[PDB]
Amino acid sequence: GPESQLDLRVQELIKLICNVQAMEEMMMEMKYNTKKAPLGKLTVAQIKAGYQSLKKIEDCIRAGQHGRALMEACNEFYTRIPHDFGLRTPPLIRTQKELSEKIQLLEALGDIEIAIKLVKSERQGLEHPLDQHYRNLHCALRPLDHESYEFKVISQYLQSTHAPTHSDYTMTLLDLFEVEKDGEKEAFREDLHNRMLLWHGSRMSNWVGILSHGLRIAPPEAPITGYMFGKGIYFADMSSKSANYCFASRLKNTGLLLLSEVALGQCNELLEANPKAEGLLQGKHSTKGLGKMAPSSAHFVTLNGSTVPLGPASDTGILNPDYTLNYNEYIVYNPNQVRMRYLLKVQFNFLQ
Numbered sequence: 026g027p028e029s030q031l032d033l034r035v036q037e038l039i040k041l042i043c044n045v046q047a048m049e050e051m052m053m054e055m056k057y058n059t060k061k062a063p064l065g066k067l068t069v070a071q072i073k074a075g076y077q078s079l080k081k082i083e084d085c086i087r088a089g090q091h092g093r094a095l096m097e098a099c100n101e102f103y104t105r106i107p108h109d110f111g112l113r114t115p116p117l118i119r120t121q122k123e124l125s126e127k128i129q130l131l132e133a134l135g136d137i138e139i140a141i142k143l144v145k146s147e148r149q150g151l152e153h154p155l156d157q158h159y160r161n162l163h164c165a166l167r168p169l170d171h172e173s174y175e176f177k178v179i180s181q182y183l184q185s186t187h188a189p190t191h192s193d194y195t196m197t198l199l200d201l202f203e204v205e206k207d208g209e210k211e212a213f214r215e216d217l218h219n220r221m222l223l224w225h226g227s228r229m230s231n232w233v234g235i236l237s238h239g240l241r242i243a244p245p246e247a248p249i250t251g252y253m254f255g256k257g258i259y260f261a262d263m264s265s266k267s268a269n270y271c272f273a274s275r276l277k278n279t280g281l282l283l284l285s286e287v288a289l290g291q292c293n294e295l296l297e298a299n300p301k302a303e304g305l306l307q308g309k310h311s312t313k314g315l316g317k318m319a320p321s322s323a324h325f326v327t328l329n330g331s332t333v334p335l336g337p338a339s340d341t342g343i344l345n346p347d348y349t350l351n352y353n354e355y356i357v358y359n360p361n362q363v364r365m366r367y368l369l370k371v372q373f374n375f376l377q
């Protein structure tokens with residue numbers, strides 16, 4: 026392992042997603058106790074044990090019992106997923122958006138198990154450390170030139186589809202990558218129509234697992250009430266909406282944005298959220314959450330056979346009589362409907 030073989034720009038990206046150091050920092054930011062059970066000793070069974078105990082928590086909330094029923098359930102959860110609340114007594118998990126908070130945590134943790142496994146497999150042979158990680162990812166990362174028409178589309182995709190309601194930060198595209206996870210091309214539903222290039226943002230610790238294992242669905246033991254539109258793979262057409270799931274801070278103001286070709290097909294359109302949306306798909310190939318703002322049909326350029334909704338995100342006239350989501354929510358429930366294509370290294374410009 027002498028001189029690295031990878032592109033210098035790829036080397037920068039490899040070190041970034043493969044930093045076990047910040048992985049602890051973000052888990053500690055989520056209040057996870059790295060001391061009581063370090064990330065290095067994280068079994069998938071522990072996470073499947075965590076999911077089950079979250080389901081026992083939804084079983085309490087649905088039954089409405091807030092006594093010991095919930096107090097025992099939450100503690101049992103915390104024992105498998107050690108937390109750190111210090112002074113205050115640990116909190117009771119009571120809401121759909123508190124449930125989603127922990128399913129977010131268990132996902133990020135599972136994507137870290139994948140990660141540390143890949144960094145621990147580096148032995149010490151004839152390859153440079155960074156090159157060994159890349160090979161283990163079994164996914165290709167071609168860096169694109171800033172003057173590429175691909176780059177021209179992405180920057181105009183990035184900023185022109187930045188929602189006006191996420192004004193507390195501007196976004197700036199530091200580099201752009203061509204993604205091809207091995208086998209993904211070989212199974213993408215080429216048949217399905219409505220082929221679109223959709224956003225997915227995720228925390229920094231998750232990208233090794235995402236570039237290696239794709240974007241899986243939720244395990245069966247997960248609480249069903251936790252997922253907004255059901256156990257699927259969520260996307261958005263607005264760059265800022267997916268960039269919010271990057272969870273960049275004013276101090277760690279860099280992130281990664283996953284533009285992937287999503288085979289949506291015929292959409293089931295919904296206004297109010299509903300987790301049991303997978304049961305009511307009935308031949309439709311995806312669920313679409315209907316918002317007020319979205320890129321207008323008059324700016325839909327095509328890139329490698331996929332529709333890229335540019336232009337300013339005009340209004341859509343959507344309004345629910347009975348909550349109306351502001352922005353559109355796409356959900357595909359099988360990975361064959363998703364092929365990753367472009368990854369974006371994005372710097373966040375927060376405003377005070």
Ligand SMILES: Cc1cnc2c(C(N)=O)cnn2c1
Nearest residue numbers: 225226253259260261267270
């Ligand atoms: C319910 C839900 C979950 N995740 C996302 C993302 C993302 N992960 O980038 C975008 N919209 N969205 C919506």
